[PDB]
Every structure is written in C-alpha cells, then in structure tokens.
C-alpha cells in the first residue's frame, strides 16, 4: 500500500553508498534505491543482504530478478 509518490534517484544518498558497497553494481543498487524510494540504511541493509546474494550467493527469501555482472577487482 504505497502511500507516497516515486521521487527521483538520489545520487548523494547513492555516494554514500557506493562507497559503503562500491563493489556493489550502481545500476543493480539504483533499482533498490527507486525501491526505497531512495534510501540510505532502509538501501544499506537490503544492499548488505543483496550484496550476499551476488555474491556468496543466496539469502533471505526475497524475490530480485535482475541481470548485471561486474567483476573489476581491485588491483
């Protein structure tokens, strides 16, 4: 029950994040974002979550469809 209009993305509450999960996809991280209507934590837990989830791979029950792979290791 949404009650609230869908903003924008917000790149600032994205920085943050991308350096907390830089590893992490951006675009993969948006569609999280555009989904917690651009969050910081609310995007941070489900981003540390998620992050297993490409990563280790599995977690939580949650349903995320979605196609990216980015394998730049650092070095």
């Given at each position: 029950?949404?009650?609230?209009?869908?903003?924008?993305?917000?790149?600032?509450?994205?920085?943050?994040?991308?350096?907390?999960?830089?590893?992490?996809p951006e675009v993969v991280?948006?569609?999280?974002?555009?989904?917690?209507?651009?969050?910081?934590?609310?995007?941070?837990?489900?981003?540390?979550?998620?992050?297993?989830?490409?990563?280790?791979?599995?977690?939580?029950?949650?349903?995320?469809?979605?196609?990216g792979?980015?394998?730049?290791?650092?070095?």
């Open positions: 029950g949404s009650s609230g209009s869908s903003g924008q993305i917000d790149f600032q509450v994205l920085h943050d994040l991308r350096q907390k999960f830089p590893e992490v991280v948006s569609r999280c974002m555009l989904q917690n209507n651009n969050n910081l934590d609310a995007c941070c837990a489900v981003l540390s979550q998620e992050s297993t989830r490409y990563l280790y791979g599995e977690g939580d029950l949650n349903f995320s469809d979605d196609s792979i980015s394998g730049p290791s650092s070095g």
